Structure formats: structure tokens, C-alpha cells
Amino acid sequence: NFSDYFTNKTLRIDYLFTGNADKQSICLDELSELPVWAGRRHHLSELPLEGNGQIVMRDVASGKVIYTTSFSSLFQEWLETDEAKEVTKGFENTYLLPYPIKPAEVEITLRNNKREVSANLKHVVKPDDILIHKKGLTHITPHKYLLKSGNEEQCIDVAILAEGYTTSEMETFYKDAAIACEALFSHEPFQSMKNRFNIVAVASPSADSGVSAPKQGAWKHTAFGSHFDTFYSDRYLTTSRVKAINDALAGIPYEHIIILANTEQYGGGGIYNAFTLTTAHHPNFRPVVVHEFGHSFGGLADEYFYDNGLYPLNIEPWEQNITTRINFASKWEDMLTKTTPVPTPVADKAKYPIGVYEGGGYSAKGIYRPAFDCRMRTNEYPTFCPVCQRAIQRIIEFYTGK
Amino acid sequence: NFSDYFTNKTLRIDYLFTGNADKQSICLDELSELPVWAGRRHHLSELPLEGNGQIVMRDVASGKVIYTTSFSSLFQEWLETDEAKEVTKGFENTYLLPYPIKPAEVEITLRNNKREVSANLKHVVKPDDILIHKKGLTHITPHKYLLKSGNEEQCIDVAILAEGYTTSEMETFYKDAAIACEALFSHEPFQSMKNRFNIVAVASPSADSGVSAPKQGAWKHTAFGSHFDTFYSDRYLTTSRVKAINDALAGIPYEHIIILANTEQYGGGGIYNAFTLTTAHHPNFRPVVVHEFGHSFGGLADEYFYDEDVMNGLYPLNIEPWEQNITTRINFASKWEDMLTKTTPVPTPVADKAKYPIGVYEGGGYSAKGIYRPAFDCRMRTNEYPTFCPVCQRAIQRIIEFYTGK
Ligand SMILES: [K+]
Ligand SMILES: [K+]
Ligand SMILES: [Zn+2]
Ligand SMILES: [Zn+2]
Ligand SMILES: [Zn+2]
Ligand SMILES: [Zn+2]
């Protein structure tokens, strides 16, 4: 099947998402070619999760769907901030597609939290277009495999990138990458699925040590320009230099990205099929990086809650570890016992390792999570809950087989 | 007074221009602070040329216009190509403004080739906003002054950047930069106005030697990702990495950018108040770099016309171009009518060329008919002719005087 439509290369597409809270738009930045296809070769027309946006590639001749994938984005977060009620802003976003033999139509769609299409772009890619930038042939960033279970066609390729490390302190970065990798494969189900993964540490250099702190007026020259005070939230570390992130990796096989920042301050986050970014020298580095990978690889939701609006109570979330009980049969109903009370009182929690516990996806009321505590709820707790474990296991099997 | 409203710093604003042939929009990308204001300190509310887009800065308190500038853009040329009927694309663009003391409203407007508004963005810049990225303090790209006629507040600052030169090739770059400076100041009016200019050469390194040649499938890792075949025109050498060009220059006072490409392949490009790009090692390096600076500094139009060219049709025949060296005879009184002798026929027959160094010659602006140029030949039409025509010279002189006074 795969070779009916694709060569063993990557069509990398860089998009800009732009707009404000009332109107959003997608445009094309650049088309690139990478030397191998590291993604999947089966289930090419299906998705593992809905995401908040989707890309669908169709063969122009037949109209068949030949590849699809889904994601979330930082842009869709910025859309909730107060700056989005005032000015129109733009964000870089990058997707890897298998490289087609014949012309292919690519359609990318963003959805809002009511699941309405908020932006859409359909465009034809001609595989012999001379303006497709060929990348990853020379000057490949120095890197080392931490775990090499197989070739990139059969294993899930995870790249760990360096932010705020100079060339002359990569020893520290490779140590931090190993710690992150060890933390990840001490959690089930990653632990028993360890031979499905390749982990490569990529020593992308920065001119300065550390990351930028705008509030202190301390701006640094780093590989990806990460900075605190994102959206004027003091503690929120991000980078928006997505083209620079992917250029650092060109020529190295990769499907998922973890970025490690050389700093002890708390900060970071993960976004489904975008990347994880986290600080490597904070005391909670080990549980936090795994929690972020739960978002960025697992597509899981946050299970903690306050006393909101992101998850409308009349829609079933696409994330697998929270429910509004609108279509609970598609979630973890089948993992409950025939008598588990719905909702599950915290008094009887010892009785119900899996239940339907009120509180999750930031709301105390109307959203429910699968267990009382979980890596997706708190750093102190030692494991993913059984529902998150099944969710992650299903992602792994979608890409590497039962 | 300038210091009524501005400090001696630069507010750099990066925008994204996005759209297709049907619809366009502007969004803000990033605000930056550079350590000195290298631009003008008088005529702050007037424009030397209309351009295809305008920026207007207003004090929020009083509504008063405190700075303005204009430009063209690669995006606005792209909009006239066939690709813009098939996809929506986005482009980086950077503008330097004086850094305000008190909050200011910035209005950026794009106009189409009928000189009507096609996109608009207004936004407020607060001078104490913490996400204004402070640049130009450390890691300043290595550089050498080739000409230093005065400080950056008195003179026009031109930066020449290196593209496709590795660290080991920078002696060659500095030699090429000196050839370009020499070529520039061998054309009038630059020659006589040389003491109004500072020229700095900036040794920005590339990992690979040479530049990308897409038609030949040979891509190169360079500082600014320049490439031939822009809009599928073989000789059109440009970059879309406008943030990277301006980042390389952070901390060096500049107003205009010339980029030298380490290549023998023929090509160049020039866009008003954005940048010039040129091949450094082709035999026509000297006339080309000056030709492209005619676009990027002078805002001049091309005076040539080819049958099979990507740019044909950029100028509608019922609109007077804003560029000073072509006319459609829609508002010729604003152009060079006041330099014609009273008996010059309009249009001027090519047979009578000997008799009229200045006339109204049919052919220019990428159209054989309906657009007219001021002289039979000019730097803006061919590489073999030696000088700018007299209308181009006056146009350039007026730009120099706008910035540095009569
Ligand atoms: K793989
Ligand atoms: K100046
Ligand atoms: Zn989280
Ligand atoms: Zn869980
Ligand atoms: Zn030209
Ligand atoms: Zn001329």
C-alpha cells in the first residue's frame, strides 16, 4: 500500500496560523523535502485521536485519502488569551507528510472548542515543483542515540533537542537527556514497550547559556529563542521558533520532539503532536517531562481542576482521559465494573481504582476523570492511571502494531 | 523636536503579510528594541515616495502623526503571480521606527496596483511592554566600515551583508563589498553625494559556500536562504528570511540593506525599503548591484520590457505609477514633464532620440505599450549603459536630500 503513493522521503510543510479571537486563517510558509520518511506505513487514512486540527492528504487523480494526522497548537492556546481580543498575531507550525509520487492535495483544518471549523486551507503539492527546499543533506546537527531499538521505519522515533546549552556544555545536555529517557521508560506502558522506541539526543547549540527572562530584561541568544512570560504569564516558558526547531532536526529521523531547556526555573508544557518543552534542572524534572509527553505524545488532557470554558459541557472531549458523560461509551465505560457508581464518591475510592470521579480538565464540576489521582493530575503521584495507560498503549500500537 | 516624542533607540516591528489574489491581511509578529535610532530626525510626518504600503505612527494622547515611512514587499509582487490564484502564503516583513516615549498607535496599510487599500492593521505599542525583545547588545556580527562620512544620525547608513560566504571566505566578501561600494559611488548622484553615506560590511557566515539554485536542484545551507528562481523567474534572486537578515544587523546602525551572494550565476533583486540582493562574481556585478539599489533605495521602477516575463502587467494603464521614472500619462505633470524642453514631442519617436536626451519613450515597466520611460537608455533598463538617466538621477537626489537635507 504505502509504496503505491509515496517514496521513502518526507514532505515537510511549514504553515503560519494567524488571526485573533474573532477570525483565524492559515497560510503556507514553505515546502521542504527531508531524506527519509520516519512516520508510519499503516493505518494511513485513519487517525488515533481527533486533535484540535487535522491534515488530510488526498491523491489528486483518484481523490483517495492517502495520509492523515492530527495535532493541537500553541496558536489555539493564544486564542484564549486577552491579547487575542486586541491584535492579530501569527505562529509557525510544521507537519511531516510522506513524500508523494504524484500530485497530492493537502487540506489542513483547525477546530475551535465547539468543534466548528475555525480555519481551513486546501492546496495542491506537485512533487517535482522546483521550489521545494531540499533539507537535511549536509551539516546535520551533532547527535547521539540513547536507545536504538530498530530502524526508523519500524520504531517510534523521539528526538530530544537542546535549548540554552552552548557547544561547550553538551556534556550536561546529554546527561539531562538520559535522565529524561530513564524517567520515561520507568512508567508503564512505555517501560514494557521500550523496544518500540528510538531515542536520539540532538545537541543543537546556543550562543548563550540559559533562556530569556523578559520580565528581568535578560534576553539571551539561544537555539530556539525560548522565553518566560509567554502571554504575559510570568511562569510560562515557550518557543515559537518552530522552523528553527525542525531545521535543527533535518536529516535525523524523527516523529516526536522533546526540548530540554538548560535552566533550574520551573516552566514548560506539551502540546499534542507539536512538541514538549521543559526545564531540565528543576527538582521535578522527572515527573514533569513525563507529564508533558503525556500531552505531546499521548494526547492526554490535564486531570486537575479548580473551583472554565475550554471544554463545553455539551460536547464529549476528544481526549481519552476526561469525559463530560456526553458519549461515555466511547471512553472508559468498558473498563468499569458492572456496579461502579457513576459518579464515584471519593469516600468509596479504595473500592474503585477506575471510576468516574468529578473534577478534571480544569473544572471541578461537569467534567470527570478515570481515577482519583494520576500523573496527569499531580507530580507527586507515581504512575499514569489505568485509563491513561490504555490510551498511551493504543497510541503506541497504532504506530507499531498490536 | 525629535526628543519631544522619541528616545534615541529603534523600535523594530516584524509583521506577517498573508493572503492570496482574492484577500490579504496583516498580523503582528514581534516587537524589538535596537540600541540606536539610525534613521531620519526631520520630515517625520512626510513621505519621500508613496510606495505600495505605508506605516503611520501616531501619539495616542493627541492623535498627532509622529513618524511615517513607506515600502514595497515581496508579498505584494507575489500577489500578481499565478501561484497566488492557487494557494495562500505568508511573508515576513520588518520595519524600523523611532522608539516612542509615550504609547503610540501604529497603522500599517498595504495597497494594490490600483493604489487602493487592500489590508490594514492598527495596533498600540506601549514603550514599557516587557515582550519588546531587546536586541543588538551582545554577539554583534563582525563588521568593518568601508566608508564613514559621519555618525549614524547625520548620514545614510547602508549595510552590506554576506550570503553564501563561509568563515574562510570572508576576505573575498570584504573585497566584493568594496567593489560594490566603488560601483555605487561611480554613478551620479551618489558620486557627488558620497559624504552623506556610511557603508558598513557585515561578515555574516554561511555553513555552505554559494546559494541555492532550485531549478538545478542544488540547495545550500546559507545564512539567509537566498535562492534563484523566485516566482519561477530564473534571474530573480531573493530571500524570504527577512527576520534573519535584520537579526544579523542588530547592534549595527543601518537604514538600507544590500546582500552580496557568493556566486557567479546571474541574478539579483531589489524591493523598496526592504533589501537588495545581487550576485557578487558575475561579470555584470557592478551594474546589477547599482540597478537593484535603484529599486531598494531609490524606489525606481524597471524601464525594460520583455515579452515572456513574470512581472508583465504589474502596472495598470489607467493608474499613474507612484514610481518616478515611468508614466502612464495619467498624471504626467507630477513626474518629469518639468524637465522636458517645450518642443519635445510626447510620445517621443525613437528616430528622434539623438535630439532628446529626456523625452517620453514608449516601453517600460514590463510593458511594450502604454508605459513610457524618460530616456532611450538607463541603468534601470540595461546593464551595458553607463549611467542613470537624468530623471532617475533627480529622483535619487531627492531621496538623498529628503534624508540628509538640501
Ligand atoms: K519511525
Ligand atoms: K543614518
Ligand atoms: Zn499538563
Ligand atoms: Zn490518567
Ligand atoms: Zn530591476
Ligand atoms: Zn532611468
Residue numbers in the entry:
A (entry chain A): 21 to 327, 332 to 426
B (entry chain C): 21 to 426
Task: Give sentences from the paper.
Here, we investigate the substrate specificities of two enzymes of the M64 metallopeptidase family, the IgA protease ThomasA from Thomasclavelia ramosa and BF3526 from Bacteroides fragilis. In contrast, X-ray crystal structures of BF3526 in complex with substrate and product peptides, combined with enzymology assays, show that this enzyme targets the N-terminus of pre-digested proteins, but does not act on intact IgA. These findings reveal divergent substrate recognition strategies between M64 family members, while providing new structural insights into their conserved catalytic mechanism. Despite containing a metalloprotease domain with a putative zinc-binding motif, ThomasA shares little sequence homology with M26 proteases. This multidomain protein (~130 kDa) harbors a zinc-binding HEXXHXXXGXXD motif within its predicted catalytic domain, a hallmark of zinc-dependent metalloproteinases. Structural comparison of ThomasA323-878 and BF3526-STPP crystal structures revealed a conserved overall architecture of the M64 peptidase domain.
BF3526 crystallized in the triclinic space group P1 with eight molecules in the asymmetric unit (ASU) and diffracted to a maximum resolution of 1.9 Å. We could model the tetrapeptide substrate STPP in two molecules of the ASU (BF3526-STPP), and the dipeptide product PP in two others (BF3526-PP), while the peptide did not occupy the active site in the remaining four molecules (BF3526-unliganded). These findings suggest that the enzyme hydrolyzed the decapeptide, trapping the STPP peptide in the active site during crystallization, where it continued to undergo enzymatic cleavage. BF3526 comprises two domains from the N- to the C-terminus: N-terminal β-sandwich domain (NTD, residues 21–145) followed by a catalytic M64 peptidase domain (residues 163-426). The catalytic M64 peptidase domain shares a similar topology with ThomasA323-878 structure, featuring a six-stranded β-sheet (β8–β10–β9–β11–β13–β12, with β8 and β13 antiparallel) instead of seven, flanked by three α-helices (α2, α3, α4) and the loop 3. In the BF3526-PP, BF3526-STPP and BF3526-unliganded molecules, the catalytic Zn2+ ion is buried in the active site flanked by α4, β12, loop 3, loop 4 and NTD. Similar to ThomasA323-878 structure, a secondary Zn2+ binding site is located within the M64 peptidase domain, where it adopts tetragonal coordination with E323, C398 and C409 of loop 4 and C412 of α4. Notably, the scissile carbonyl oxygen of T1 also coordinates with the catalytic Zn2+ ion, which is further coordinated by H311 and H315 from α4, and D322 of loop 4 in a tetrahedral geometry. In both BF3526-PP and BF3526-STPP molecules, loop 3 shifts 2.9 Å toward the active site compared to the BF3526-unliganded molecules.
